[PDB]
PDB file of C-alpha atoms and ligand atoms in Angstrom:
ATOM      1  CA  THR A   1     -12.890   8.372  -4.583  1.00 47.21           C
ATOM      2  CA  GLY A   2     -10.407   5.819  -5.929  1.00 47.76           C
ATOM      3  CA  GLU A   3      -9.849   2.225  -4.866  1.00 46.38           C
ATOM      4  CA  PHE A   4      -6.911   0.158  -3.593  1.00 46.35           C
ATOM      5  CA  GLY A   5      -6.595  -3.551  -4.345  1.00 46.49           C
ATOM      6  CA  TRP A   6      -4.104  -6.093  -3.053  1.00 46.02           C
ATOM      7  CA  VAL A   7      -2.656  -9.539  -3.651  1.00 47.41           C
ATOM      8  CA  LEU A   8       0.061 -11.375  -1.719  1.00 46.38           C
ATOM      9  CA  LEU A   9       2.765 -13.090  -3.804  1.00 50.74           C
ATOM     10  CA  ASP A  10       5.236 -15.813  -2.906  1.00 45.54           C
ATOM     11  CA  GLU A  11       8.559 -15.056  -4.586  1.00 44.87           C
ATOM     12  CA  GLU A  12       9.719 -18.701  -4.714  1.00 40.07           C
ATOM     13  CA  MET A  13      -0.770  -9.785 -13.237  1.00 40.51           C
ATOM     14  CA  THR A  14      -4.384  -8.846 -13.956  1.00 40.17           C
ATOM     15  CA  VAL A  15      -6.831  -6.413 -12.357  1.00 38.99           C
ATOM     16  CA  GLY A  16      -9.224  -9.211 -11.395  1.00 38.55           C
ATOM     17  CA  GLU A  17      -6.552 -10.874  -9.248  1.00 41.08           C
ATOM     18  CA  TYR A  18      -6.592  -8.002  -6.736  1.00 42.53           C
ATOM     19  CA  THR A  19      -8.867  -7.855  -3.697  1.00 39.67           C
ATOM     20  CA  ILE A  20     -10.431  -4.394  -3.402  1.00 40.68           C
ATOM     21  CA  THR A  21     -10.440  -2.992   0.139  1.00 39.32           C
ATOM     22  CA  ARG A  22      -8.853  -0.309   2.294  1.00 36.94           C
ATOM     23  CA  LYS A  23      -9.915  -1.523   5.763  1.00 33.03           C
ATOM     24  CA  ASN A  24      -8.161  -3.654   8.396  1.00 34.06           C
ATOM     25  CA  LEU A  25      -5.227  -4.484   6.135  1.00 36.81           C
ATOM     26  CA  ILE A  26      -2.889  -6.921   7.921  1.00 34.25           C
ATOM     27  CA  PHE A  27      -0.140  -8.500   5.807  1.00 35.52           C
ATOM     28  CA  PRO A  28       2.583 -11.018   6.721  1.00 34.81           C
ATOM     29  CA  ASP A  29       6.299 -10.269   6.428  1.00 37.72           C
ATOM     30  CA  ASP A  30       7.057 -13.238   4.166  1.00 36.57           C
ATOM     31  CA  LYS A  31       4.965 -12.414   1.080  1.00 35.72           C
ATOM     32  CA  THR A  32       5.443  -9.659  -1.459  1.00 32.99           C
ATOM     33  CA  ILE A  33       2.630  -7.115  -1.014  1.00 33.87           C
ATOM     34  CA  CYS A  34       1.267  -6.146  -4.453  1.00 33.33           C
ATOM     35  CA  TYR A  35      -1.141  -3.246  -4.876  1.00 31.13           C
ATOM     36  CA  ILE A  36      -3.219  -1.670  -7.575  1.00 33.19           C
ATOM     37  CA  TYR A  37      -4.758   1.796  -7.393  1.00 30.90           C
ATOM     38  CA  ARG A  38      -7.731   2.682  -9.594  1.00 30.48           C
ATOM     39  CA  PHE A  39      -8.198   6.428 -10.017  1.00 33.08           C
ATOM     40  CA  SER A  40     -11.662   7.903  -9.572  1.00 28.87           C
ATOM     41  CA  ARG A  41     -11.090  10.113 -12.652  1.00 30.64           C
ATOM     42  CA  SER A  42      -9.443   9.516 -16.004  1.00 30.86           C
ATOM     43  CA  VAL A  43      -5.680  10.082 -16.042  1.00 33.94           C
ATOM     44  CA  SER A  44      -2.929  10.660 -18.588  1.00 35.79           C
ATOM     45  CA  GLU A  45       0.124   8.448 -19.022  1.00 37.43           C
ATOM     46  CA  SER A  46       2.230  11.636 -19.131  1.00 37.71           C
ATOM     47  CA  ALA A  47       0.813  13.260 -15.971  1.00 39.48           C
ATOM     48  CA  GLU A  48       3.102  13.400 -12.945  1.00 40.22           C
ATOM     49  CA  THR A  49       2.053  10.563 -10.624  1.00 39.63           C
ATOM     50  CA  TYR A  50       3.884   9.461  -7.481  1.00 39.82           C
ATOM     51  CA  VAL A  51       3.430   7.142  -4.555  1.00 36.02           C
ATOM     52  CA  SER A  52       5.131   7.425  -1.202  1.00 37.19           C
ATOM     53  CA  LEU A  53       5.380   4.913   1.582  1.00 38.99           C
ATOM     54  CA  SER A  54       5.842   5.995   5.184  1.00 40.21           C
ATOM     55  CA  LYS A  55       6.699   3.847   8.195  1.00 39.15           C
ATOM     56  CA  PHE A  56       5.296   4.612  11.643  1.00 39.79           C
ATOM     57  CA  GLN A  57       7.838   5.427  14.357  1.00 41.32           C
ATOM     58  CA  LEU A  58       7.167   8.642  16.299  1.00 41.46           C
ATOM     59  CA  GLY A  59       4.384   9.249  13.823  1.00 41.95           C
ATOM     60  CA  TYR A  60       4.742   8.451  10.131  1.00 41.80           C
ATOM     61  CA  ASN A  61       8.102   9.089   8.465  1.00 43.73           C
ATOM     62  CA  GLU A  62       8.403   9.043   4.686  1.00 41.85           C
ATOM     63  CA  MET A  63      10.619   6.241   3.389  1.00 39.21           C
ATOM     64  CA  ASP A  64      10.831   7.404  -0.209  1.00 40.84           C
ATOM     65  CA  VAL A  65       8.761   8.353  -3.229  1.00 40.07           C
ATOM     66  CA  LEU A  66       8.451   6.597  -6.559  1.00 40.47           C
ATOM     67  CA  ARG A  67       7.294   8.027  -9.877  1.00 39.37           C
ATOM     68  CA  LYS A  68       4.495   5.930 -11.399  1.00 38.44           C
ATOM     69  CA  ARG A  69       3.235   5.771 -14.957  1.00 40.12           C
ATOM     70  CA  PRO A  70      -0.554   5.300 -15.143  1.00 39.67           C
ATOM     71  CA  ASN A  71      -2.179   2.863 -17.533  1.00 43.68           C
ATOM     72  CA  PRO A  72      -4.715   5.172 -19.236  1.00 41.29           C
ATOM     73  CA  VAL A  73      -7.035   2.351 -20.342  1.00 42.72           C
ATOM     74  CA  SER A  74      -7.500   0.647 -16.971  1.00 40.46           C
ATOM     75  CA  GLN A  75      -6.972   3.978 -15.118  1.00 38.12           C
ATOM     76  CA  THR A  76      -4.556   2.283 -12.713  1.00 36.62           C
ATOM     77  CA  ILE A  77      -1.072   2.295 -11.265  1.00 37.20           C
ATOM     78  CA  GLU A  78       0.466  -0.815  -9.695  1.00 35.84           C
ATOM     79  CA  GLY A  79       3.391  -1.556  -7.407  1.00 36.13           C
ATOM     80  CA  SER A  80       4.702  -3.952  -4.805  1.00 35.84           C
ATOM     81  CA  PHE A  81       6.702  -4.115  -1.579  1.00 39.73           C
ATOM     82  CA  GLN A  82       9.171  -6.952  -0.881  1.00 38.40           C
ATOM     83  CA  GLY A  83      10.787  -7.375   2.514  1.00 39.08           C
ATOM     84  CA  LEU A  84       9.117  -4.611   4.558  1.00 37.97           C
ATOM     85  CA  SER A  85       9.979  -4.862   8.254  1.00 40.57           C
ATOM     86  CA  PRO A  86       7.064  -5.520  10.627  1.00 40.32           C
ATOM     87  CA  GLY A  87       5.257  -2.292  11.389  1.00 42.10           C
ATOM     88  CA  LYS A  88       2.580   0.158  10.366  1.00 41.69           C
ATOM     89  CA  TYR A  89       2.722   1.804   6.930  1.00 44.90           C
ATOM     90  CA  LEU A  90       0.990   4.616   5.062  1.00 45.93           C
ATOM     91  CA  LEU A  91       0.818   4.566   1.260  1.00 47.99           C
ATOM     92  CA  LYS A  92      -0.035   7.883  -0.415  1.00 47.44           C
ATOM     93  CA  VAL A  93      -0.950   8.507  -4.058  1.00 48.74           C
ATOM     94  CA  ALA A  94      -0.127  11.875  -5.647  1.00 49.69           C
ATOM     95  CA  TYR A  95      -1.436  13.155  -8.975  1.00 50.01           C
ATOM     96  CA  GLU A  96      -0.304  16.430 -10.564  1.00 49.80           C
ATOM     97  CA  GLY A  97       1.110  17.721  -7.279  1.00 48.26           C
ATOM     98  CA  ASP A  98      -1.740  16.869  -4.877  1.00 47.12           C
ATOM     99  CA  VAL A  99      -2.094  13.909  -2.546  1.00 47.42           C
ATOM    100  CA  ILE A 100      -5.388  12.397  -3.723  1.00 44.74           C
ATOM    101  CA  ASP A 101      -5.680   9.231  -1.627  1.00 41.73           C
ATOM    102  CA  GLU A 102      -3.957   7.230   1.079  1.00 44.08           C
ATOM    103  CA  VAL A 103      -4.289   3.918   2.902  1.00 43.89           C
ATOM    104  CA  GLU A 104      -2.768   2.277   5.987  1.00 46.89           C
ATOM    105  CA  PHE A 105      -1.668  -1.336   6.424  1.00 48.36           C
ATOM    106  CA  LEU A 106       0.164  -3.437   9.039  1.00 50.74           C
ATOM    107  CA  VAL A 107       3.042  -5.887   8.390  1.00 49.23           C
ATOM    108  CA  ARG A 108       3.362  -8.591  11.041  1.00 51.12           C
ATOM    109  CA  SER A 109       5.846 -11.320  11.878  1.00 50.57           C
ATOM    110  CA  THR A 110       4.453 -14.693  10.820  1.00 48.15           C
ATOM    111  CA  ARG A 111       4.031 -15.810  14.456  1.00 47.98           C
ATOM    112  CA  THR A 112       0.713 -15.489  16.461  1.00 48.14           C
ATOM    113  CA  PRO A 113      -2.453 -13.987  14.923  1.00 49.03           C
ATOM    114  CA  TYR A 114      -3.550 -10.359  15.253  1.00 46.63           C
ATOM    115  CA  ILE A 115      -6.916 -10.089  17.036  1.00 45.06           C
ATOM    116  CA  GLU A 116      -8.667  -7.101  15.483  1.00 49.57           C
ATOM    117  CA  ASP A 117     -10.368  -5.753  18.622  1.00 52.89           C
ATOM    118  CA  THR A 118      -7.788  -6.484  21.353  1.00 51.33           C
ATOM    119  CA  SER A 119      -4.332  -6.186  19.731  1.00 52.77           C
ATOM    120  CA  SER A 120      -2.097  -3.162  20.325  1.00 54.70           C
ATOM    121  CA  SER A 121       1.529  -2.263  19.606  1.00 53.25           C
ATOM    122  CA  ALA A 122       2.280  -2.322  23.360  1.00 52.23           C
ATOM    123  CA  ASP A 123       1.266  -5.911  24.216  1.00 49.97           C
ATOM    124  CA  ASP A 124       3.527  -8.935  24.682  1.00 52.86           C
ATOM    125  CA  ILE A 125       2.781 -10.407  21.236  1.00 53.02           C
ATOM    126  CA  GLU A 126       3.245  -7.250  19.120  1.00 53.58           C
ATOM    127  CA  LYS A 127       6.186  -5.832  21.116  1.00 51.39           C
TER     128      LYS A 127
HETATM  129 NA1   NA B   1       8.040  11.731  13.194  1.00 49.40          NA
HETATM  130 NA1   NA B   2       9.169  -2.105  -4.272  1.00 51.49          NA
END
């Protein structure tokens, strides 16, 4: 299994700067969300690699896909998302035709914290 890592950037990069995790990802809407993906196997710079991002509405809907060129030494791809609207997102990684990994994250308006155990999309703060 591969690994996702993240760093938040103020508009106003090295592998060690990223925080490696795929759980409880909650990002603000005023920082650029930068990710790295480290493949569990070795990869070729010429192999067809894509990411897609989907936004949750009535279930996830694909926003678009983007061709990525792997770094074959670090075995990574990297990207970033500027200006996503608040919501729930699904990032998928495809290699040579197959989806090989995916991860969810939330984007929230910078106003009132998200309580991990009690928050829901249908409460006064999130809605
Ligand atoms: Na749908
Ligand atoms: Na982008």
